Design an enzyme around this catalytic site. Structure first.
Site, mmCIF file in Angstrom:
data_model
loop_
_atom_site.group_PDB
_atom_site.id
_atom_site.type_symbol
_atom_site.label_atom_id
_atom_site.label_comp_id
_atom_site.label_asym_id
_atom_site.label_seq_id
_atom_site.Cartn_x
_atom_site.Cartn_y
_atom_site.Cartn_z
ATOM 1 N N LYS A 174 0.825 -1.202 0.000
ATOM 2 C CA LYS A 174 0.000 0.000 0.000
ATOM 3 C C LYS A 174 0.861 1.254 0.000
ATOM 4 O O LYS A 174 0.502 2.264 -0.622
ATOM 5 C CB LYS A 174 -0.941 0.000 1.206
ATOM 6 C CG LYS A 174 -1.975 -1.094 1.166
ATOM 7 C CD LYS A 174 -2.704 -1.213 2.502
ATOM 8 C CE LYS A 174 -3.323 -2.585 2.611
ATOM 9 N NZ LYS A 174 -4.606 -2.496 1.899
ATOM 10 N N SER A 189 -2.437 12.276 29.867
ATOM 11 C CA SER A 189 -1.658 13.238 29.092
ATOM 12 C C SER A 189 -1.210 14.395 29.946
ATOM 13 O O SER A 189 -0.212 15.026 29.627
ATOM 14 C CB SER A 189 -2.496 13.748 27.913
ATOM 15 O OG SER A 189 -3.740 14.173 28.408
ATOM 16 N N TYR A 190 -1.915 14.687 31.039
ATOM 17 C CA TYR A 190 -1.472 15.785 31.895
ATOM 18 C C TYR A 190 -0.088 15.500 32.465
ATOM 19 O O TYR A 190 0.847 16.321 32.369
ATOM 20 C CB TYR A 190 -2.487 15.972 33.020
ATOM 21 C CG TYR A 190 -2.103 17.085 33.959
ATOM 22 C CD1 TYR A 190 -2.331 18.418 33.609
ATOM 23 C CD2 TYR A 190 -1.501 16.827 35.175
ATOM 24 C CE1 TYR A 190 -1.982 19.454 34.455
ATOM 25 C CE2 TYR A 190 -1.147 17.861 36.032
ATOM 26 C CZ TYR A 190 -1.385 19.186 35.659
ATOM 27 O OH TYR A 190 -1.039 20.239 36.506
ATOM 28 N N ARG A 191 0.072 14.316 33.057
ATOM 29 C CA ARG A 191 1.347 13.945 33.649
ATOM 30 C C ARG A 191 2.413 13.723 32.592
ATOM 31 O O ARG A 191 3.599 13.903 32.871
ATOM 32 C CB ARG A 191 1.161 12.680 34.520
ATOM 33 C CG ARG A 191 2.406 12.300 35.330
ATOM 34 C CD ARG A 191 2.076 11.386 36.529
ATOM 35 N NE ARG A 191 3.297 11.050 37.266
ATOM 36 C CZ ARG A 191 3.959 9.899 37.167
ATOM 37 N NH1 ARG A 191 3.529 8.925 36.373
ATOM 38 N NH2 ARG A 191 5.057 9.720 37.891
ATOM 39 N N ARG A 192 2.023 13.401 31.373
ATOM 40 C CA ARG A 192 3.012 13.311 30.312
ATOM 41 C C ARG A 192 3.421 14.679 29.773
ATOM 42 O O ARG A 192 4.229 14.740 28.843
ATOM 43 C CB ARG A 192 2.484 12.450 29.169
ATOM 44 C CG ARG A 192 2.193 10.993 29.607
ATOM 45 C CD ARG A 192 2.115 10.024 28.423
ATOM 46 N NE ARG A 192 1.182 10.425 27.367
ATOM 47 C CZ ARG A 192 -0.136 10.221 27.403
ATOM 48 N NH1 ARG A 192 -0.714 9.632 28.435
ATOM 49 N NH2 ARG A 192 -0.895 10.614 26.395
ATOM 50 N N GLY A 209 -7.447 15.538 26.938
ATOM 51 C CA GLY A 209 -8.805 15.140 26.579
ATOM 52 C C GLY A 209 -9.709 14.983 27.777
ATOM 53 O O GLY A 209 -10.935 15.115 27.657
ATOM 54 N N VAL A 257 -9.292 14.523 32.543
ATOM 55 C CA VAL A 257 -8.397 14.558 33.697
ATOM 56 C C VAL A 257 -8.563 13.233 34.430
ATOM 57 O O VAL A 257 -9.691 12.863 34.792
ATOM 58 C CB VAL A 257 -8.714 15.727 34.632
ATOM 59 C CG1 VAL A 257 -7.698 15.777 35.768
ATOM 60 C CG2 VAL A 257 -8.756 17.052 33.873
ATOM 61 N N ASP A 288 -12.140 11.414 35.567
ATOM 62 C CA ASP A 288 -12.029 10.063 36.088
ATOM 63 C C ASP A 288 -11.344 10.174 37.434
ATOM 64 O O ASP A 288 -10.357 10.908 37.575
ATOM 65 C CB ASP A 288 -11.226 9.151 35.151
ATOM 66 C CG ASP A 288 -11.857 9.014 33.755
ATOM 67 O OD1 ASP A 288 -13.057 9.330 33.561
ATOM 68 O OD2 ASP A 288 -11.138 8.574 32.824
ATOM 69 N N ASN A 318 1.963 1.500 27.324
ATOM 70 C CA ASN A 318 1.583 0.372 28.174
ATOM 71 C C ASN A 318 1.547 -0.921 27.379
ATOM 72 O O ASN A 318 1.909 -1.989 27.889
ATOM 73 C CB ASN A 318 0.198 0.574 28.782
ATOM 74 C CG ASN A 318 0.124 1.709 29.767
ATOM 75 O OD1 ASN A 318 1.109 2.165 30.340
ATOM 76 N ND2 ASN A 318 -1.073 2.176 29.960
HETATM 77 MG MG LIG Z 1 -9.545 9.278 31.334
HETATM 78 MG MG LIG Z 2 -6.873 11.173 30.153
#
Ligand SMILES: [Mg+2]
Ligand SMILES: [Mg+2]
Ligand code: NA
Ligand code: NA
Length: 310
Positions: A62, A167-170, A176, A178, A235, A258
């Site tokens: 492809k 993504s915050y800690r990264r 998107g 918390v 979350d 992961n």
């Molecule tokens: Mg989440």
């Molecule tokens: Mg998240």
DNA sequence: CGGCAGTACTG
DNA sequence: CAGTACC
DNA sequence: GCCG
């Protein structure tokens, strides 16, 4: 990314397979797209394409087709249903099976869904926040949401540790949602807090809707005070202190990191989950008081969260 | 041939 | 249970 | 889809 002329086209195929429910083919496309997006050179040989992990015969071809002709024949034959299935499965709580059923029943727009579909409690919340949940927030807003949860948790018990992960800690500029993880060093006092903590967060009008309220994890919707605020996914997960290192690693991600780490563990006769790093054939839980211990027991050099953003 | 993760939650 | 979601 |  010297191959976005390839990866754009593959991303269309990836999503078409994803929303039609072929998750394994969708996974393979996703892997090849990620490999293509971090190679140094532009590909330009079928033997070069085979060169990279995650790209095999069918996908080499492809790239060889967009190679020469500049587009991909298979793209022209994607079912007309795909954009509608994508629309429906972007409702939180609706996945591929619900999207395909609504499609089969003749629904074609969110107006059809609103007017005529039977929605679960979760999907009605999803629909009500359809646009908000597709929007990312500035990481500065994520900090305010974490500090809101932290304040409320540390009011009922001073010792509670609360850490925003994902993504915050990264270190990303956008998030998107918390993902807040709560534990307590005493190993004990983490249980049974939700009743108190969520009622507190409801006292503010901060929590606006609940999607999931289990014994250990809460998923819902919040909104900070003032004008110009949007509803945000939140979350909250409570874990025993012994599992804090593995939970921190799991919920920090990324999801592909992961996945890479579970594969590496399996090559060593171990397993890695959000709860523990274990031997396997179940197996023995190994002691991991810190994220560094997980890497060390996997024989890997430690990676800070920002270098897990795979 | 078949794994590519396991679990928590909903109804 | 199937389906969906968390990384 | 990839790969063992
Ligand atoms: Mg989440
Ligand atoms: Mg998240
Ligand atoms: Na290859
Ligand atoms: Na969805």
């Amino acid at each position: 990314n010297h191959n976005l002329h390839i990866t754009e086209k593959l991303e269309v195929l990836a999503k078409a397979y994803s929303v039609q429910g072929d998750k394994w083919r969708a996974l393979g496309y996703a892997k090849a797209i990620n490999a293509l997006k971090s190679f140094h050179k532009p590909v330009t040989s079928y033997q070069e394409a085979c060169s990279i992990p995650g790209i095999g015969k069918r996908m080499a071809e492809k790239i060889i087709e967009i190679l020469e002709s500049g587009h991909l024949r298979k793209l022209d034959h994607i079912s007309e249903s795909v954009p509608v299935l994508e629309l429906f499965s972007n409702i939180w709580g609706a996945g591929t099976k619900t999207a395909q059923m609504w499609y089969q029943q003749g629904f074609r727009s969110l107006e059809d869904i609103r007017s005529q579909a039977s929605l679960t409690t979760q999907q009605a919340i999803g629909l009500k926040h359809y646009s908000d949940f597709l929007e990312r927030m500035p990481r500065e807003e994520a900090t305010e949401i974490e500090q809101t949860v932290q304040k409320a948790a540390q009011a009922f018990n001073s010792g509670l540790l609360c850490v925003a992960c994902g993504s915050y800690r990264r270190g990303k500029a956008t998030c998107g949602d918390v993902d807040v993880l709560i534990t307590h060093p005493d190993g004990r006092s983490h249980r049974g807090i939700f009743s108190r903590l969520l009622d507190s967060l409801r006292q503010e009008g901060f929590l606006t809707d609940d999607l999931v309220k289990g014994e250990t994890k809460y998923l819902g919707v919040c909104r900070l005070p003032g004008p110009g605020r949007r509803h945000r996914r939140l979350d909250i997960i409570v874990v025993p202190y012994s599992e804090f290192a593995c939970a921190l690693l799991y919920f920090t991600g990324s999801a592909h990191f992961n996945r890479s780490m579970r594969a590496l563990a399996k090559t060593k006769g171990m397993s890695l989950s959000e709860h523990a790093l274990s031997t396997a054939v179940p197996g023995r839980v190994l002691p991991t008081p810190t994220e560094k211990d997980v890497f060390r027991l996997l024989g890997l050099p430690y990676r800070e969260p920002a270098e897990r953003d795979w």
